[PDB]
Amino acid sequence: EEKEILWNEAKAFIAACYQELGKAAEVKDRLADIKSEIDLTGSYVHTKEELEHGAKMAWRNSNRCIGRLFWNSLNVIDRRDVRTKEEVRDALFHHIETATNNGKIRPTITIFPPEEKGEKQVEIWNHQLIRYAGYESDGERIGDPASCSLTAACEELGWRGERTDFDLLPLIFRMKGDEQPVWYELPRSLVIEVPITHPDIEAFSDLELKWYGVPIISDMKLEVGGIHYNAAPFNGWYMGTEIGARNLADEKRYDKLKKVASVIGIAADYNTDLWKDQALVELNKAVLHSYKKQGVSIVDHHTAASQFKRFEEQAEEAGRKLTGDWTWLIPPISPAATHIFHRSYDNSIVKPNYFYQDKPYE
Amino acid sequence: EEKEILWNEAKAFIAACYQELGKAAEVKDRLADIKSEIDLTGSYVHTKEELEHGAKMAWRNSNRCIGRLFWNSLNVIDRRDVRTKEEVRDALFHHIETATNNGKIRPTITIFPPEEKGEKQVEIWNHQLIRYAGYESDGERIGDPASCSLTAACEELGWRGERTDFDLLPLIFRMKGDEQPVWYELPRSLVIEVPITHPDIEAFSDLELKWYGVPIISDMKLEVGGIHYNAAPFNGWYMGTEIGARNLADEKRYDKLKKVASVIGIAADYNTDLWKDQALVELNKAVLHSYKKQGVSIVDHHTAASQFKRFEEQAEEAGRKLTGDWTWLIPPISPAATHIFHRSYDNSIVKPNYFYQDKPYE
Ligand code: HEM
Ligand code: HEM
Ligand SMILES: CN(C)c1cccc(CNCc2ccc3ccc(N)nc3c2)c1
Ligand SMILES: CN(C)c1cccc(CNCc2ccc3ccc(N)nc3c2)c1
Ligand SMILES: C[C@H](O)[C@H](O)[C@H]1CNc2nc(N)[nH]c(=O)c2N1
Ligand SMILES: C[C@H](O)[C@H](O)[C@H]1CNc2nc(N)[nH]c(=O)c2N1
Ligand SMILES: [Cl-]
Ligand SMILES: [Cl-]
């Protein structure tokens, strides 16, 4: 029943993967071994080659990702050998340091042991490995509202935030067999942050905005050939609009546009003045400038779309169908100035891929 | 076969329309008369009430339109009585004058006789009643590229444009029974145009940009209760981004962003400077300012989205399902600053509605 779904996914994945690696001759014997491994054990184990190419294919198939041109240079770290919470913690610390790479960000994924019988071996509670806490009590909002429920769960576990607007959440995860997760403070030496300044407007630093260097998404499931890697944190570098048009701008996040309008010296009184739009552009210019000034990788949305056009061209040249989610591929700033806006994309789901999964808290 | 599709659409429309007008008692007898009219004649004729409410319902059901809050105040002009090309021309001139209303634009639709057996009585060739010509020969681009094929068709018919960037195309339409359409120059006294200036930047007038006041879309088919009104030009007022983010900005339209960047004094050299985004905001601010200064109706995209939220609320309160096309409802400038971006919409097609139809030329 599960052995069948597994075997089917395995056949489809091994054939495609080995074809891409020029190993098509070896498919028959590999499939043989897998068939017997599933019968005898209920699952099968990927070779390091399969796992690495699977994680790359999964990125290539992520419909909502504009950054896919670089799928084949993903740095895959195989941590299927971890058994203890100290090993998990150290692997997550390592991922941070190696992905950060002193600012020259390396797209990286660390892959932990996969689910067995739907039973997780390691369950990561963080949304990203580096993320700010959020607090909301009696009229008072502090930090990142998107982090309120995770922050409250951490404080249930004896963590306590300083209640600045930028408290770093601890790493928090649970091991199989433990009733409760454990948490560990992030060593500050590992976390690069960027203060936001503006190239022309000196007063912009008065807002005391900053953001962290590397987004390391840690709550998605990587599925490859029927094997479910629920713990497999990965990162790229930011596209600037994620920080400037959403994290710092959204009313339900840091909600900074009125403050930006004031420091750039425009009124925030009339919709027809387009002050939100002007403030968005200046905040986004500041974000790109600040990351560049500090030597931390970042891409602007025009360059990102130009790279994505090359991804489309490369897909066609390779004879692979392109899939994509137009609603997520268009940037939230000047979308009609990118080619993405003016074409359509087939939003079909192809595996290997990355998937949402239920939060373990809340 | 056609009588059946017709009767079915008629039943569904009359029931809904009379329910909305509180006339539900009259449905049975009206349906009786319609049934007999279809049998004996192959079609049926709407009452003036049905036609007016049908055109309003069709606007209310237009998934891609952000301006729908005002659906019930559509001004419906019934021109089912026209038989001659002089009457058509005069009705189109009249629509322009009454919709323009000296700048205080009235949303209006003029409805011409409907198709008989799929046979058009009047076939309008213009995309909008007021639109600029476009020319493209040997490296030289003049005017609006989107108008190139219609412009060439007009010049086949003995029209000749002055080849400015803003030549007004003639009205062009064909009567049933004529092999060729006729064309008529627009009287300049009927056409309001707005020069684009910027509230703060004096040099912006150097670009010598202008646009026309009223968009009167004249190539869509209005379908109401199975009756096909292929000729039924309608207008609202502009949302500013249509002019500033698309008509004047698109590379395949007037392509003005590099020129805007230069007059606003920013470099157009580096994607990371976000110069296209900054130029877009300034051009859009100029457009709203210029229309307002001249007393010509226009709405900015924030206010438009706020009105659309009220449309959603009104639909819910009335017990009607809301339908919408998220990809067209989001504005092309700061879309994530509107509520539209953050919710989803059911893109189902409900009739009465407005539909694309095949161009009669090209
Ligand atoms: C190299 C730099 C990268 C850039 C600039 C980039 C850019 C983006 C952006 C802008 C989004 C939209 C998310 C949002 O709007 O919040 C996105 C979505 C996504 N990216 Fe990438 N990305 C990169 C690398 C990666 C990598 C390395 C992976 C995995 C190996 C990945 C997988 C995804 C996935 C799965 C989504 C969709 C997430 C969801 O549905 O919530 N990306 N990417
Ligand atoms: C009162 C002011 C109005 C505003 C501000 C408005 C705004 C808009 C906008 C911005 C669009 C998107 C089109 C584009 O991006 O190029 C649109 C689409 C549309 N509007 Fe409205 N609209 C208004 C009135 C009307 C009226 C009076 C009707 C018909 C009675 C109408 C029917 C439509 C239709 C059918 C579409 C979709 C056209 C297509 O698929 O190409 N609108 N509207
Ligand atoms: C809480 N919140 C705002 C949230 C919650 C769940 C999912 C998301 C969307 N995740 C966006 C995402 C995923 C992968 C990325 C890889 C690289 C990159 N630059 N951005 C990514 C953004 C948000
Ligand atoms: C040539 N071109 C750019 C084109 C061709 C066909 C269809 C369209 C989209 N029409 C947009 C439209 C329709 C109705 C409107 C009513 C009011 C308003 N302010 N804008 C409208 C825009 C474009
Ligand atoms: C195919 C693709 O979705 C297409 O470019 C659409 C996107 N949404 C749009 N939205 C508006 N308002 N106008 C357009 O012309 C388009 N084009
Ligand atoms: C439901 C609705 O489509 C939703 O708000 C989407 C739109 N597209 C998006 N695109 C990105 N990049 N990020 C988002 O959070 C969303 N939200
Ligand atoms: Cl983020
Ligand atoms: Cl237009």
Curated annotation (Swiss-Prot), chains A, B:
Catalytic activity: 3 reduced [flavodoxin] + 2 L-arginine + 4 O2 = 3 oxidized [flavodoxin] + 2 L-citrulline + 2 nitric oxide + 4 H2O + 5 H(+)
UniProtKB keywords: Heme, Iron, Metal-binding, Oxidoreductase
Enzyme class name: oxidoreductase
Keyword hit for NAD: no
Record bears the keyword Metal-binding: yes
GO biological process, one term: nitric oxide biosynthetic process
Note from the entry: This protein is similar to the oxygenase domain of eukaryotic nitric oxide synthases but lacks the reductase domain which, in eukaryotes, is responsible for transfer of electrons to the ferric heme during nitric oxide synthesis.
Quaternary structure and interacting proteins, as annotated: Homodimer.
Family the entry assigns: Belongs to the NOS family. Bacterial NOS oxygenase subfamily.
Name this protein carries in UniProt: Nitric oxide synthase oxygenase
Source organism (scientific name): Bacillus subtilis (strain 168)
Gene that produces this protein: nos
